[PDB]
């Protein structure tokens, strides 16, 4: 059973533990946001805005720093900074949850504002570190370990996304179960301890996987941040894969979510918790099946053809969504159609995203991958920021139809731009 010691499985374990810690972290942040502060749209809105803006402005420099330094060093640097930030913030959660009642009651004033600024800043640092580590490990290490065998690379990406989805659906359940059985303070203590132990394990694990893959080793004073930012963006514009990334960034502006807890608008309206649980489970299962579908389609049709098929599937499913919303309380039929539509739009979106990830990992000169992926994430979060602004501009329940129409339109635009890329790079169907 040498598969247990092969760098493949070791890397899957590393990504799995990192994602598990991150998902516990995000669920705990949401529990803080809701238990202390009421279900207020603007708190979550400003949280998302701060995170998205910081990653937007820092993606190019993060990618440049990833590319310039050694893969090993940047890998554990990002890992350690992420884990220390999450541990410190888990300690802060311990203190605040142990002070929930009297913070709400005895001493009003700026204490809530101070704790919320601290939570958002440390969460933003943690998410920046998560973006850095995701870029470096996924892109560079996956492409190098997979080598020139592109089927193995596709399997790598697909199984990574499956692990991501299974974590996203299980970790919130585990954190909720333990927190209910104990107390929020116990939940936060457990999360902090688990992040610590996972930090140690993943440090050792990255050291191990580095050994087994020798190919990784071969590889105003603020003027230089702007020069690097401009150089990275212009390099990304010249990259022939620009259209696919642009369309993916468009696809990340959809309002039909049910993806995670930090990003959601059904809860913004106020839907019941059981329905959200069922929708999240269906979305996770459908995303896993979508990864399977992308694996199956890449072998039969071309990679660009696979992306195009995913695009048509996703677009037609959102056509089903817009038919559902356009139909004349509300009948159960319309809501059921909208729910099935978002669930199958999920499979379309994930097949498309795996395809675009494959293109990005494939068509880079390998001297520039970090910067290209960093600006890719910056664009993704830029259109996520516009998504957040659009949500902010329409709190009213009597705007959901317009919001859905806008999201479908932007999805269509993204797939049209990917279609332009397909025409450019094939000229054959």
């Amino acid at each position, epitope marked *: 059973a040498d598969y247990l010691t092969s760098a493949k499985f070791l890397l899957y374990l590393g990504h799995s533990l990192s994602t598990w810690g991150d998902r516990m972290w995000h669920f705990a942040v949401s529990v803080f946001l809701v238990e202390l502060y009421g279900n207020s749209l603007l708190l979550t809105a400003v949280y998302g805005l701060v995170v998205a803006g910081s990653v937007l402005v820092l993606g190019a420099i993060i990618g440049d720093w990833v590319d310039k330094n050694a893969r090993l060093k940047v890998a554990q640097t990002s890992l350690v900074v992420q884990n220390v930030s999450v541990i410190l913030c888990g300690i802060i959660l311990m203190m605040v949850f142990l002070h929930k009642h009297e913070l709400l009651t005895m001493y009003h004033g700026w204490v809530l504002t101070s704790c919320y600024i601290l939570i958002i800043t440390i969460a933003n640092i943690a998410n920046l570190a998560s973006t850095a580590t995701a870029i470096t490990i996924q892109r560079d290490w996956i492409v190098v370990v997979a080598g020139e065998d592109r089927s193995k690379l596709a399997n790598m990406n697909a199984t990574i996304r499956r692990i991501d989805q299974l974590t996203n659906i299980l970790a919130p359940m585990a954190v909720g179960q333990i927190m209910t059985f104990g107390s929020p303070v116990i939940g936060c203590g457990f999360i902090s301890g688990w992040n610590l132990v996972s930090m140690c394990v993943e440090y050792v694990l990255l050291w191990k996987v580095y050994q087994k893959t020798p190919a990784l080793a071969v590889k105003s004073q603020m003027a230089e941040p702007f020069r690097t930012f401009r150089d990275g963006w212009v390099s990304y514009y010249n990259q022939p894969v620009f259209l696919a990334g642009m369309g993916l960034a468009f696809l990340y502006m959809t309002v039909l979510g049910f993806d995670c807890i930090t990003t959601g608008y059904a*809860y913004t309206q106020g839907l019941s918790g059981s329905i959200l649980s069922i929708l*999240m489970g269906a979305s996770a299962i459908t995303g896993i099946m979508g990864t399977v579908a992308f694996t199956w389609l890449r072998r039969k049709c071309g990679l660009v053809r696979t992306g195009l098929i995913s695009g048509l599937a996703q677009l037609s499913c959102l056509i089903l969504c817009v038919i559902s919303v356009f139909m004349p309380s509300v009948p159960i039929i319309s809501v059921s159609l909208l729910f099935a539509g978002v669930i199958a739009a999920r499979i379309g979106l994930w097949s498309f995203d795996l395809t675009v990830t494959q293109l990005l990992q494939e068509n880079v000169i390998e001297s520039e991958r970090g910067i290209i992926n960093g600006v890719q994430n910056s664009m993704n979060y830029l259109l996520d920021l516009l998504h957040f602004i659009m949500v902010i501009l329409a709190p009213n329940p009597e705007a959901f139809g317009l919001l859905v129409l806008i999201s479908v339109s932007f999805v269509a635009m993204g797939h049209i731009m990917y279609f332009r890329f397909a025409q450019n790079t094939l000229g054959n169907k």
Partner: nanobody
Amino acid sequence: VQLVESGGGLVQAGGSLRLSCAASGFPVAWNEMRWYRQAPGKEREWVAAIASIGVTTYYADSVKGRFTISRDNAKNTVYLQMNSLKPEDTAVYYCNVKDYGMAFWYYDYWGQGTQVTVSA
């Protein structure tokens, strides 16, 4: 997200009466609302149920038919119309919400309670 209900009191047996639950922080069309009875000397019992998504009711077996429940999204409230009130109906009514919260973090929220008594 505190909720308040009013309209309790005393009516002759076999009469009719109407409790009105007014809710503020949460929708009363996207969350399962139910009613419970708190009779003296015994623990609480289930009255009726409105589903979260559809307008379908799940009245209790013992009191089925003779109770009616209806939600109103415009006024942001839910109603119970009572008919043919019997002496065993004397109890304290609790307006509640089940399964409100996160995708995987949700609770049950309760009202202050109103006294409804039946005399013969």
